[PDB]
């Protein structure tokens, strides 16, 4: 499932911002 | 009026932004208590003003490490906005000032903790929960656009929730008052428009697509484009393709597709009719949004508060202590603040 793999990913933490 | 509203809410915003309030309080006058939030150049701390009994949020910036990240303009721009904005879901700029070492922003203290915090333990919300906040970011985004300002970082981690279960925006340090388009790569990879990592000037559209992905996120309970890395990221948002749970309503599925737009002269936000197009959209249709600008309608959540001061809601972060060097660095760089 789409949840199983989110929450499997290494993105389910505070995302940081990008930048340059 | 809304028109009218916006023409007085601009002209209150012009006098602030042309003389910014600085140095409107000292170091000294706070009692530092907790870390609620870390950042690449510095952390949020739950302080207590001595003076009122009043407690705050202050964040405070390490101007070297500001220096390092080339982020001396936008620090710059997010302390003369804040200083001048003035809206209920905004987060409020108590006082301002700097030292030999560091700045600081003392804000109003939201206890509720991050959207974050309360999405990824709850897993979504529901239609009615996530239409509730969109709302209120629409107004946000209506106001901040009406004066010439993009925010270029909505995402959960930026919203807080008050004590009235009502969001509270965080986080002006990508914020810009522009009037023509703009072209730095900035944001958080799940939210970038097309545009952005495209290197295209872009322009307030990007605020727009970060709102749909933000619906989608509290929606479904995971962001419409994920993967390990940014790269890949990158890739999912340029293609466009946006798949929807089963359970997304119709009425949900059409907003998604107008907010996560590649096509700027489809975009909802972006045409002739504006912010319209989006308050009118049947998703909407029993939003009262006059009545959620006054604070009336009732919250889908009330976040649990023990007390004043209470940290709870928020997750634990290492304590450093607070150096302040006994020579003055990076003057020059921020003579403004
Ligand atoms: C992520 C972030 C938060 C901030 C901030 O200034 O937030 C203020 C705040 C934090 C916690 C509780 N109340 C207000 N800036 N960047």
Redesign the pocket.
């Known amino acids: 499932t789409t949840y199983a793999d989110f929450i499997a990913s290494g993105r389910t933490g505070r995302r940081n911002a990008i930048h340059d | 009026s809304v028109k009218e509203f916006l023409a007085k809410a601009k002209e209150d915003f012009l006098k602030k932004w042309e003389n910014p309030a600085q140095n409107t309080a000292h170091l000294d006058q706070f009692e530092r208590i907790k870390t609620?939030?870390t950042?690449s150049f510095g952390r949020?701390m739950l302080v207590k003003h001595m003076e009122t009994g009043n407690h705050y949020?202050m964040?405070i910036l390490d101007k070297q490490k500001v220096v390092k990240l080339k982020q001396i303009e936008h620090t710059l721009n997010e302390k003369r906005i804040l200083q001048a904005v003035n809206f209920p879901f905004l987060?409020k700029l108590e006082f301002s000032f700097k030292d030999n070492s560091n700045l600081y922003?003392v804000?109003?203290?939201?206890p509720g903790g991050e959207m974050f915090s309360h999405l990824r333990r709850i897993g979504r919300f529901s239609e009615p929960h996530a239409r509730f906040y969109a709302a209120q970011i629409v107004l946000t985004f209506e106001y901040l656009h009406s004066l010439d300002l993009i925010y270029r970082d909505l995402k959960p981690?930026?919203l807080?929730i008050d004590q009235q279960g009502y969001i509270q925006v965080?986080?002006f340090?990508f914020a810009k008052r522009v009037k023509g388009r703009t072209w730095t790569l900035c944001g958080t990879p799940e939210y970038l428009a097309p545009e952005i990592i495209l290197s295209k000037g872009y322009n307030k559209a990007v605020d727009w697509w970060a709102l749909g992905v933000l619906i989608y996120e509290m929606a479904a309970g995971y962001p419409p484009f994920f993967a390990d890395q940014p790269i890949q990221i990158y890739e999912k948002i340029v293609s466009g393709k946006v798949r929807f749970p089963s359970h997304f309503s119709s009425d949900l599925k059409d907003l998604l597709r107008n907010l996560l737009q590649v096509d700027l002269t489809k975009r909802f936000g972006n045409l002739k009719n504006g912010v319209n197009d989006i308050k009118n959209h049947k998703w909407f249709a029993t939003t009262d949004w006059i009545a959620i600008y006054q604070r009336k309608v009732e919250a889908p959540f009330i976040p649990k508060f023990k007390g004043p001061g209470d940290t709870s809601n928020?997750d634990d972060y290492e304590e450093e202590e607070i150096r302040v060097s006994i020579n003055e660095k990076c003057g020059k760089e921020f003579s403004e603040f």
């Open positions: 609620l939030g950042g949020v949020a964040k987060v922003m804000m109003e203290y939201v981690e930026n807080l965080t986080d340090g928020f």
